[PDB]
């Protein structure tokens, strides 16, 4: 049961260094080769590089020697550092295990083989934006249930950059939850809404709290949503 979770800054300024981490759970880092892949808005998947056992890393020349991948076995963490960033480095960054295969097409003794890699286990990804614009934490408002199931929610207003995560009742309330894709306003600010459809006769008795996380601004808002005063 090996599991990967990435964490990062969410926002870096051009010419600075982007640093992401991947926490590994369920097994020793030592039992895998490791790699980073990113997914940029409007571009396909891009392979950044990989690191083998002896701390030996090989990088895609597309990153022009701006990249360092390393392991910290005392924390079971994989690291990526990308320096001299530009807006073209804005992407979702994924950690993954890599499986090295060897395809022999002639005599091995004559080096007639090639190595290839399959990426078999992936993390969930962490979004990093490169912009000179400053971060902005959201304002969260309750979207109260109809007085007449009913839908209630939270309005997550005016933030930058993406993303924001929303849970309900600290993860304990997942059925009927729908967090919508954010709208990108002309201001370049984002807003989203998260909704949950719950039984009407639960209202006033059952506590509904939307937990809003905007990591880049270090904003965590816990918003109770109760029925209209009316």
């Amino acid at each position: 049961q090996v599991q990967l979770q990435e964490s990062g800054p969410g926002l870096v300024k051009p010419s600075e260094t982007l640093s992401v981490t991947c926490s590994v759970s369920g097994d020793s880092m030592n039992n895998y080769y490791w790699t980073w892949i990113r997914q940029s808005p409007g571009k396909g998947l891009e392979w950044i590089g990989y690191i083998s056992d002896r701390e030996s890393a090989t990088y895609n020349p597309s990153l022009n020697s701006r990249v360092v991948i390393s392991r910290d076995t005392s924390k079971n963490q994989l690291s990526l550092k990308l320096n001299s960033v530009t807006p073209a480095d804005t992407a979702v960054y994924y950690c993954a295990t890599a499986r090295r295969g060897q395809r022999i097409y002639g005599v091995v003794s004559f080096g007639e083989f090639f190595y290839y890699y399959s990426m078999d286990v992936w993390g969930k990804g962490t979004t990093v934006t490169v912009s000179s614009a400053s971060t902005k934490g959201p304002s969260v408002f309750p979207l109260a249930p109809s007085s007449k199931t009913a839908a209630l929610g939270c309005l997550v207003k005016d933030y930058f950059p993406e993303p924001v995560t929303v849970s309900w009742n600290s993860g304990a309330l997942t059925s009927g939850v729908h967090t919508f894709p954010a709208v990108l306003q002309s201001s370049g600010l984002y807003s989203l809404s998260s909704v949950v459809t719950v039984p009407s006769s639960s209202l006033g008795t059952q506590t509904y709290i939307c937990n809003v996380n905007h990591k880049p601004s270090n904003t965590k808002v816990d918003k109770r949503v109760e029925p209209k005063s009316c």
Partner: protein
Amino acid sequence: VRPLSVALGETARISCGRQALGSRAVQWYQHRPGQAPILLIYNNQDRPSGIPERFSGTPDINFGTRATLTISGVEAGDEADYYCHMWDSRSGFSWSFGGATRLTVLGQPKAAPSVTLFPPSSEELQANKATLVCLISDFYPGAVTVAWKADSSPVKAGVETTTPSKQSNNKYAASSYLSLTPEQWKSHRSYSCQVTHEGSTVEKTVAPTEC
């Protein structure tokens, strides 16, 4: 991207974007929006546990056999970007995952949108702002028209609407926001969010004077 469309239940055949010279080892990846990529096929034909046996790759058997990903009984849930990561003995290290084939799966049942309209919260109004929130979900196909009315007059001020995008259940979701002054909110009899989809309309209305 290379767009490809296939009807529900049919067999999709996705060709690798580049063809192999000599001995090859091909991996296929599926990437759905909002998810990490997934390994479908490796070493040409090998299938990881957990991947449906509906997916298969072409064996390298010394025919001029183009590497192809076959998906039998194509489902709505197979709509994704597909990557063929081609390695061969003549081409050198394969840094590129290649371009994506964006598979669209057609023939799905029309589904009318669920629409929920929220008026401004008392908390937002206290902060001297007001946003009407229109959430539109569970519809198919994805083409939709979203209009706002103040009383019965059409409105185009303060309106920010998303491009519809696929949900996990493979129907579409969208939202529209109407920004108002508290004074505008309170001075009208009502505001409506009107969603027209495949020739029919779902419309919700809110009013400052009603709970």
